[PDB]
Amino acid sequence: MYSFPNSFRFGWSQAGFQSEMGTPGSEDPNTDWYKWVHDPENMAAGLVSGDLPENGPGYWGNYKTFHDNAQKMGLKIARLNVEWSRIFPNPLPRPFDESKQDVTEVEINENELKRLDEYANKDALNHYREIFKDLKSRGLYFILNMYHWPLPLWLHDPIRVRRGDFTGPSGWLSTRTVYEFARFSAYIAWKFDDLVDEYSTMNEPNVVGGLGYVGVKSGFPPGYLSFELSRRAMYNIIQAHARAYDGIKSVSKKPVGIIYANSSFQPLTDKDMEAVEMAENDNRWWFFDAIIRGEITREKIVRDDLKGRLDWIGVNYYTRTVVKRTEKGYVSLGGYGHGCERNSVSLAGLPTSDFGWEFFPEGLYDVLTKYWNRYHLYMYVTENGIADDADYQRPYYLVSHVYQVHRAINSGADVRGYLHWSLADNYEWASGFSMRFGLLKVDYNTKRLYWRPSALVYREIATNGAITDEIEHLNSVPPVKPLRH
Amino acid sequence: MYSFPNSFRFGWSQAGFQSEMGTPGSEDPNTDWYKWVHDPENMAAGLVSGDLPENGPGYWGNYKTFHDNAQKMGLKIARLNVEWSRIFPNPLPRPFDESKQDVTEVEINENELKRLDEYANKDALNHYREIFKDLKSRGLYFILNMYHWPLPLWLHDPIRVRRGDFTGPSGWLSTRTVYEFARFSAYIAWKFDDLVDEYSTMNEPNVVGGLGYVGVKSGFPPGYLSFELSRRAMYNIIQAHARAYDGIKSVSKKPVGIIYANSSFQPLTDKDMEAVEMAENDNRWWFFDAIIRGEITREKIVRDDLKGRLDWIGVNYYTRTVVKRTEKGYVSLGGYGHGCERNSVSLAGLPTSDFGWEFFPEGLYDVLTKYWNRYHLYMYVTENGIADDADYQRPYYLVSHVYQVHRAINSGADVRGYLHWSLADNYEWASGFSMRFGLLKVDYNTKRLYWRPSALVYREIATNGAITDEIEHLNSVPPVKPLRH
Amino acid sequence: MYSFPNSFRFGWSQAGFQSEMGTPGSEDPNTDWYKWVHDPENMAAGLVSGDLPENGPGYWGNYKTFHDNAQKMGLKIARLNVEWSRIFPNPLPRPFDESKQDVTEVEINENELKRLDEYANKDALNHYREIFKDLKSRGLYFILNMYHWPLPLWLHDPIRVRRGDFTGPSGWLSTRTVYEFARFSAYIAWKFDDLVDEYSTMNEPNVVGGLGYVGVKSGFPPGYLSFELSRRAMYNIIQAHARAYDGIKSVSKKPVGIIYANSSFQPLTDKDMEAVEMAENDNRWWFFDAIIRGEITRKIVRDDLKGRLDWIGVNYYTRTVVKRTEKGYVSLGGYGHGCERNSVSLAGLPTSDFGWEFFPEGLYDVLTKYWNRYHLYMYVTENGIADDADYQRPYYLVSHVYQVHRAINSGADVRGYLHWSLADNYEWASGFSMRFGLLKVDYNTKRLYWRPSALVYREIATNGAITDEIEHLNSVPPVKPLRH
Amino acid sequence: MYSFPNSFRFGWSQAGFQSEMGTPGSEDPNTDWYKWVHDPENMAAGLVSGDLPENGPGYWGNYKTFHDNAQKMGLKIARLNVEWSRIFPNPLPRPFDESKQDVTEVEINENELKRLDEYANKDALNHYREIFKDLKSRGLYFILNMYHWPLPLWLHDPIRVRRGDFTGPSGWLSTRTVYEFARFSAYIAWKFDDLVDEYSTMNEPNVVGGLGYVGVKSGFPPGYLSFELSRRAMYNIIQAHARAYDGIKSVSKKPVGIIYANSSFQPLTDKDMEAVEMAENDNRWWFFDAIIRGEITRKIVRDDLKGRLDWIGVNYYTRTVVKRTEKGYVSLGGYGHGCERNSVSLAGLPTSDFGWEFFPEGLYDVLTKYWNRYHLYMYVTENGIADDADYQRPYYLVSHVYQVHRAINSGADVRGYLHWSLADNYEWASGFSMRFGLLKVDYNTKRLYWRPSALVYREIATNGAITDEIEHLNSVPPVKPLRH
Ligand SMILES: OC[C@H]1N/C(=N\O)[C@H](O)[C@@H](O)[C@H]1O
Ligand SMILES: OC[C@H]1N/C(=N\O)[C@H](O)[C@@H](O)[C@H]1O
Numbered sequence A, B: 001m002y003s004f005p006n007s008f009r010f011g012w013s014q015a016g017f018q019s020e021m022g023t024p025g026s027e028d029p030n031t032d033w034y035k036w037v038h039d040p041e042n043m044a045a046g047l048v049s050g051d052l053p054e055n056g057p058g059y060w061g062n063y064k065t066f067h068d069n070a071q072k073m074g075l076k077i078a079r080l081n082v083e084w085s086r087i088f089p090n091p092l093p094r095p096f097d098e099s100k101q102d103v104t105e106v107e108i109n110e111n112e113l114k115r116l117d118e119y120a121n122k123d124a125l126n127h128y129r130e131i132f133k134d135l136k137s138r139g140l141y142f143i144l145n146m147y148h149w150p151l152p153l154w155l156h157d158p159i160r161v162r163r164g165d166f167t168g169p170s171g172w173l174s175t176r177t178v179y180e181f182a183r184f185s186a187y188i189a190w191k192f193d194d195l196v197d198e199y200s201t202m203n204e205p206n207v208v209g210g211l212g213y214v215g216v217k218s219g220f221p222p223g224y225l226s227f228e229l230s231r232r233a234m235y236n237i238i239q240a241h242a243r244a245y246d247g248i249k250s251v252s253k254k255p256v257g258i259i260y261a262n263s264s265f266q267p268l269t270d271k272d273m274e275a276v277e278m279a280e281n282d283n284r285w286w287f288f289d290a291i292i293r294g295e296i297t298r299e300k301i302v303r304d305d306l307k308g309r310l311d312w313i314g315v316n317y318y319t320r321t322v323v324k325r326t327e328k329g330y331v332s333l334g335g336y337g338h339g340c341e342r343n344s345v346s347l348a349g350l351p352t353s354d355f356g357w358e359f360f361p362e363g364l365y366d367v368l369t370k371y372w373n374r375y376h377l378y379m380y381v382t383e384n385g386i387a388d389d390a391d392y393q394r395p396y397y398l399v400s401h402v403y404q405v406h407r408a409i410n411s412g413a414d415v416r417g418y419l420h421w422s423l424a425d426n427y428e429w430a431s432g433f434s435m436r437f438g439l440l441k442v443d444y445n446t447k448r449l450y451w452r453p454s455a456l457v458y459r460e461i462a463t464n465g466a467i468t469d470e471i472e473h474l475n476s477v478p479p480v481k482p483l484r485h
Numbered sequence C, D: 001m002y003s004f005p006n007s008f009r010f011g012w013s014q015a016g017f018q019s020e021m022g023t024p025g026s027e028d029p030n031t032d033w034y035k036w037v038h039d040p041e042n043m044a045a046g047l048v049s050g051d052l053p054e055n056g057p058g059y060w061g062n063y064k065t066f067h068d069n070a071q072k073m074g075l076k077i078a079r080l081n082v083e084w085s086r087i088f089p090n091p092l093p094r095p096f097d098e099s100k101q102d103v104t105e106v107e108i109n110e111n112e113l114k115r116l117d118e119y120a121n122k123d124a125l126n127h128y129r130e131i132f133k134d135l136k137s138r139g140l141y142f143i144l145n146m147y148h149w150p151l152p153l154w155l156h157d158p159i160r161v162r163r164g165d166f167t168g169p170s171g172w173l174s175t176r177t178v179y180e181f182a183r184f185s186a187y188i189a190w191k192f193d194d195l196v197d198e199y200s201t202m203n204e205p206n207v208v209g210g211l212g213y214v215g216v217k218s219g220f221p222p223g224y225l226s227f228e229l230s231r232r233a234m235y236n237i238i239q240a241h242a243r244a245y246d247g248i249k250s251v252s253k254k255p256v257g258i259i260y261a262n263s264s265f266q267p268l269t270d271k272d273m274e275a276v277e278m279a280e281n282d283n284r285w286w287f288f289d290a291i292i293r294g295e296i297t298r299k300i301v302r303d304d305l306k307g308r309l310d311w312i313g314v315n316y317y318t319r320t321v322v323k324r325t326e327k328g329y330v331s332l333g334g335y336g337h338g339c340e341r342n343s344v345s346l347a348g349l350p351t352s353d354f355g356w357e358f359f360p361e362g363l364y365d366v367l368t369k370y371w372n373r374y375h376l377y378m379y380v381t382e383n384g385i386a387d388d389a390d391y392q393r394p395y396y397l398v399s400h401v402y403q404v405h406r407a408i409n410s411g412a413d414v415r416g417y418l419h420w421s422l423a424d425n426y427e428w429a430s431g432f433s434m435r436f437g438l439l440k441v442d443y444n445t446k447r448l449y450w451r452p453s454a455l456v457y458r459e460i461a462t463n464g465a466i467t468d469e470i471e472h473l474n475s476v477p478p479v480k481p482l483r484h
């Protein structure tokens, strides 16, 4: 048996855009992501799958059923977001010098919050209250995240930007978005603080800027290929996180963290340890050193307005990245980690998921302990999961990763929960519905939810607060012989 | 949901030779099967795997744990056998004309039973009582089967017979074995009737004679290739069943049936329906017409001593057989049913097990309804299961077959239980330990039992007496795309 | 036996950018494609493989060896191109109103050619002459193609355009490229007509416009996603074809054709035949009806477009399966070029190292459809398979050659079969990993090796037939031993 | 380039029972093997495939075509056998005490040969003469083998023996077979010495005894499982070899050898070298030490066994991996001949249609070990692969031929390489599905087709070398595109 602390919580994470739509009356056409996935040119190019979010699992209407199953499964924590676009579907009054690079302060007071309240959609606000009240009534501790990728269209027209036209609303390329996100986050905290246990500002900002402006084959908006603009978006999102932290703290005493996309960097050969360190710098430390230590590049400076804006770290983990040394520095290798063939085996002989992601649970131990040792901030594992409609690998994937969290705690790391991605299948961005990450399988025709055998396994874990002796054998690699190569 | 009658029982089947040994003090070296699997020439030839039963899951010593898990899983029925060899390890007094073809009667009375009792091993008898009492204490209804393949060595030296020497104990080739089996069965019923709910005489006699004397590549004892001797063994086993039925009835009022190896015969093309009928005659009806209607070939005769010796039919089902018409009659086709490649796909694109057996749950409906329509005797599904260490396919296999039993009942067939093969992994005959059929995985080093996710699924079924709405999606074919081709 | 007419020739096709570089001294940095595959951002995005064409098979230096092997293989025809960038690496003085949509005429004469002559790189001109003379000396009939995708950088800066900046050299989006292309083509014919047997203006203009401005995941320059700009590019390249035809004919009496990317459109179900016809309209007929019948949409007849084609080069690899929809028709993934690599299609047919389905019947379909609509003679200017191991190529080669025999048998005038390609080469955005050669290239030494399919092709070419002994290869590669 | 000595010959091997039947008039029902594969019980058991050799490739009728193709392929050597059953289909009068264990001498002279002559089938004798003369006329050096597994039914009724009945004709279990074999072999040399270049007494006697009486799942006659009878069979066949050697030498001065089944024994870990040596003793040295040095266990020296060998025929397909145990050593499944069909071994190496691992290094190992122990010259009398598709064969062929070049380079006297086989044939208990031919056979028409490997072998044989152009095929077939 592997037993967890009495205060440790098992649960799940979910995003608004991916799960909300699907039931009558739930449609939210007012984001960049919505327009992006409906775009005829994006469709013809194959940048997006052609599946549409309004045909989704319908959490907007069916949230009670989701919660009923989560309670039956013994879950005790949930992390969800509000969609910015549903609360402010129309523009707010121009407030502030758009040409200044830095946003060091955003003043928000009771009077400004009351003005904002005049513009907010009240049906959306009341619906979210009805969702969150139900959530809390099933004994789920609630982490509220402010942002999980889609921006209101009045803040970002991604097609115009894809086209190389920067005269319109330009998303994370504009400090206006930074200013409005701060106000939005303070506002949400102001409205929902009675229901919330902890806050996250953002989900995976590094993915927003990285796939948006560099990894353009991923079909993430605005899909404009530019190193320079990727840096500018990342700079703005960092200061937005900081301003949102101050904003929430102005109305709440509760903890405020951030959720980030992690990979475990692994050396190809024993001569590649430095390459790993450089990769960890370039992908992880530079970001967290900005929002914790205020250290940033603009020249290399310390900003007092950035320093100390973080109470906890949300660790999103799926797989590793294998790196090797170069003359220039380091490179990541194809055929390991997230760059494998789908339903196959990596160059290391480890099985890959429906998404082509390599099975590597040890990497979670690596990531949790590395964060712990650098910053000594407590963490939650805010995402971990696998694309697997058949449920062949998921029982092993779940048990193995949960075990590595037990290992991290054992070594001294403060980790207070594990939240699987996800409770149910949902709309996987540019890939559409084909990538199924749910403990529960969704029939998209009826919206019925089904317990995959992994869900029964998770229920064993959660109800016992332990990997029990009876399922401990799942702490292993799925046998590769009967799977596709 | 698919709900079963309130009186319907879900459970499991297990064989003594396959599961008993493994714990200190459990060794039974006194069968033909034991000698067969230890034989140096059989090993060198690869007729047997080289694995040995004395390294097995240890039900002899660990039965309480097996039963504890079966109770936790909500099971309510079990079918097990006594090993003849453990009760009578030494020969009994010659009793009876060995040259007579037919055995129409075997007189057994109280006095003869008391004499037999002088020769029986009392430690073995008391141990089996301790096993069965525990079984009954977990609320399991008990089907006691008399015979599941291994014969005492004093009745069969399979190596001598393999060598073409018929001067020694010749197993089912001798009417002495028929006479002794009758006495053995009456004796066991006489000793255990207070603990038993229903009786089976034999498990799969058609396999004993078919693999023993025709399908010699299977490495079943005595492995002597002879159409003529296969017919003689089958003739003797039929009359043995009949004499055992009379013997048990002499001491018990309880129901007495038999368990038989079934395949669903399927036509290659729509012009092959007659081929199916001929296959059903040659593999199924000829046998059951003998022991129910007394009809047999010796010339084609009716034996009053055979007629009506059957209260119920145990249906063992794994997969189909595809047949086509010939000039001579019919032939079965490779690449379907049990003749596929391991961990692959059949010629019909259906996934195959670790044993190379094709996924075909519809065949169970075929078999149950065919039996029902011919004889109108109630049945139990006494075996159904899959070789699958990884547990990839078993969740689908279990749910799908259980569904087909619901279908058969719905159509009017009297089916009173479903017994999975098996509760735990065990020694799979000539194949050894590599073929794992358990709901529970066995670690053969420690003898610890582990719940595969299919076991959690079975528990849902059994505790609810239904395929619940939540697991109903498993009533489908395992997706082939992520599995080996 | 399947015997071809005595005049039928077997040979091969190759492209300058794909095969020329690799030997020191061969480097041509002056194209949009060179810049495109060296671009840091494109590399980081994975739009290009990171492989570089200067590490190629080195036809520039080693052409004599290529030709030696082709002769040993019994080949009697070759289609190659000159690279525009090599001949005119520096910008030409502006000549002509750039805002006019149509380019109906480009005046070229002796004096204008002599002027152009003074900008041309003479080292490049003499080298091509040396390559083509050696070609001719090995008995190879010569189809000279003017254009196989790279443009001089002075006509197209693809990174600027990718970035959404239209103030620079804009490639096929500008009538200046049309004008200069007409002049380039007249100029090359003027210099090389003594060596050339037939001309092609261009290779697969449909792919240039289609992957350049719509299929942007393919990493083709300039990778600017726009239906409107895709139409404009195609409009320009059509008129460039016509002006190039007139330009060549002003200096030569030899046949002038075009090489085009074809797929065989096949119905998913028997209820999808109309979808096939719509697909053929949208992908094939619209284009050829423009340059043959002058019919275009801008729906009019342009007399400067009409009749500008003597022959049709058919490039064929695989099929495309289509179904009817409400709005029209869609192509289906899991068939044709949209399959998993080294696997099988949704129909159970084997796929190549590139994920393309084995479907040789499609070639018969494409040849006979063209023949029945236009009655212009054809060459199969490309057909081949990405297959480093050589597992499928023997079957692929014999099966497709058989379909050409079928086409001829049914009445179609097909005059040659040119395999893609003689040796491995640089496969555009995919780099070197896609190996189409009858000959394998060791890129470290530039040595060529005969894959067994080359021995099989020698049998066909030397005999002018699929011989009795290799006739079994007219079948699908057995899928059981291959990856699924 | 890898050039062979000028005297080195490339060719092929084939067996009478596997290749002769198929043409009407060729049927030979008089062997144990014929009876064995027609047996109803064996068929029902799956011990034999159900395929029948009378539906074969038809070398009996079509030998001229086989030879025509072999000549076109540049082959200069052939090893075949006469079928005993064809020459003596009826029982010979009993001659000699059958209960004596040793057969140290068999007296054969002119008069005894003339007597035998009166029992011989003359139609069969003349037909073989016609086949061998046509062979010789195509420039093929001729190795005549006396025995390649089938015995006349009058010497072995395999079904009787399978059933455990030892009162009938018992094949290699009886010294009568030894006696008659010596006489048969002297007789054939007597009739055919004018046509023959070198002799082999027998093909793979280790397999006859080993699969016949131990590996009974292989479906080899008589399939009676007995360690003791396996030893007795092997003892008899050894002395039959020796008596056959003396018999041939009484009528001929030509070289007399033996063809044997080899595997290259390889250690699982570096701690398994002793296991390899024990494996080589138990599978190879014990046998050759008997017929070369007269050393045998009955542990003595037999002067009638000593020195009865001029040359060694090495049959090689794959390796066997072994490990040390307490009791000795064991062979490991997942390597060598014990792999899954059309997949990869535990070492990641591709396997054939028969499940045999690609391991050409083993041939170098086997050739040099023999050479170093005995210093007798060798021929590679079999090497090939079950591969209907021809995916692996080009690599298999070139790689193994290279290892022969390696062996010669290191000093071993190897004089030829004979591929198994020229055309597909009847693969014993497996039937026709295992196709080893350089030429594919259509069994419906008996037509032969050149797989691309045949074109590759023509390159090797005609040049007497692995040429520069095919040298890349000296490598492992890429596993990525193949089934796993
Ligand atoms: O891929 C599954 C999830 N993975 C994620 N990060 O890796 C995203 O936060 C989430 O929205 C889903 O995309
Ligand atoms: O193959 C699994 C089981 N199958 C059986 N019949 O098919 C036997 O009764 C049982 O003992 C096990 O062999």
Ligand SMILES: OC[C@H]1N/C(=N\O)[C@H](O)[C@@H](O)[C@H]1O
Residues within 6 Å of the ligand: C015, C018, C203, C204, C261, C315, C317, C382, C420, C427, C428, C436
């Ligand atoms: O893909 C192989 C070839 N195929 C082509 N068209 O499909 C191009 O003309 C040629 O340049 C190569 O890309």
Ligand SMILES: OC[C@H]1N/C(=N\O)[C@H](O)[C@@H](O)[C@H]1O
Residues within 6 Å of the ligand: D015, D018, D203, D204, D261, D315, D317, D382, D420, D427, D428, D436
């Ligand atoms: O397996 C291919 C050949 N291999 C053989 N030995 O391994 C036999 O000599 C020959 O008759 C064929 O069986």
